[PDB]
């Protein structure tokens, strides 16, 4: 637990002092944008100094106050500036303006895994094991800090130019030591304890992991239907039909990950994360090399190239004084 205690200490220290106003909008120059949302815009910018390319989000204070989404926008920045993991997108610069927010994070070139997965159709089980192993370490790091992710999906997994994972979206993130109740996520990745309106803890991410692995190896999510209300019935039913080409080790790992019983699910038992790390499916996985990122990636994207993607008066300023 040497790395575990070092991470928690440096996290809780950074958590109490959340840095801000550490750069200037004018310093970066505007480059072609990457995407937009209901609350703001996601862009790629270049710093005049050696910083150069950077991915930055510009959020409007009107948007987060209008739909009461302000609860998740304050958690997002604070969690980002305090974590330090290879598979998490590094937050570099953070500052506020009279009308906009600024989270300068690393630009990831390879694009969303959802794109590559849909192109290829399916990932080979070795290809899936490489991506899944990074998430397991990413969850163990976030669960030792009492954080839950609550939005695991291929559309939120970015591939860097070295073929590795960079988890991007932290909106629905929050640290809980017990349970929470907020309905957030994607219907095809919601855990049963979320749909039933019962309380849910850190075990929802280990459910989402089983869905993510299923979608990588099969090419489609395990629960799907015309109407979202049918998806909820399928999720709580506990009946999953595995594809033929699935291995015996993979089908066994998914039944434990996609367990409706919250206390018979891997990552929630007494052993914890090593329940999954020491599974017959992850036998070929060297976890120390994955963390240190010294493993040949099974796929490196084609490669700043954006080739893989497709009033001035202060308003509500005191509402974001912490930011």
């Amino acid at each position: 637990k040497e790395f575990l205690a070092k991470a928690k200490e440096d996290f809780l220290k950074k958590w109490e002092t959340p840095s801000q106003n550490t750069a200037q909008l004018d310093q970066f120059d505007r480059i072609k944008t990457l995407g937009t949302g209901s609350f703001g815009r996601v862009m790629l910018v270049k710093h005049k100094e050696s910083g150069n390319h950077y991915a930055m989000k510009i959020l409007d204070k009107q948007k987060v106050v209008k739909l009461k989404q302000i609860e998740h926008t304050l958690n997002e920045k604070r969690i980002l500036q305090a974590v330090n993991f290879p598979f998490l997108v590094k937050l570099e610069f953070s500052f506020k303006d009279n009308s906009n927010l600024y989270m300068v994070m690393e630009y990831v070139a390879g694009g969303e895994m959802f794109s590559h997965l849909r192109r290829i159709g399916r990932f080979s089980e070795p290809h899936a094991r490489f991506y899944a192993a990074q998430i397991v370490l990413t969850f163990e790091y976030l669960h030792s800090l009492d954080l839950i992710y609550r939005d695991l999906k291929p559309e939120n997994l970015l591939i860097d130019q070295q073929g590795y994972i960079q988890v991007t979206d932290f909106g629905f993130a929050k640290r809980v030591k017990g349970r929470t109740w907020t309905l957030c996520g994607t219907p095809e990745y919601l855990a049963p304890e979320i749909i039933l309106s019962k309380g849910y803890n850190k075990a929802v991410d280990w459910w989402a992991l089983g869905v993510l692995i299923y979608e990588m190896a099969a090419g489609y999510p395990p629960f799907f239907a015309d109407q979202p209300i049918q998806i909820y019935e399928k999720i709580v039913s506990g009946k999953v039909r595995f594809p033929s080409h699935f291995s015996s080790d993979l089908k066994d790992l998914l039944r434990n990950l996609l367990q409706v019983d919250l206390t018979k699910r891997f990552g929630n038992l007494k052993n914890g994360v090593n329940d999954i790390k020491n599974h017959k499916w992850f036998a070929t996985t060297d976890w120390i090399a994955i963390y240190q990122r010294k493993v040949e990636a099974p796929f490196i994207p084609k490669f700043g190239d954006t080739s893989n993607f497709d009033s001035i008066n202060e308003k509500c300023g005191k509402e974001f004084t912490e930011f």
Binding site: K153, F172, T182, T186, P187
Partner: peptide, 16 residues
């Protein structure tokens, strides 16, 4: 018993 393309498109996140 189909694999409809609407179930295979990009998926957004909701909040309530």
């Amino acid at each position: 018993g189909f694999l409809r393309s609407a179930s295979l498109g990009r998926r957004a996140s909701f909040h309530l």
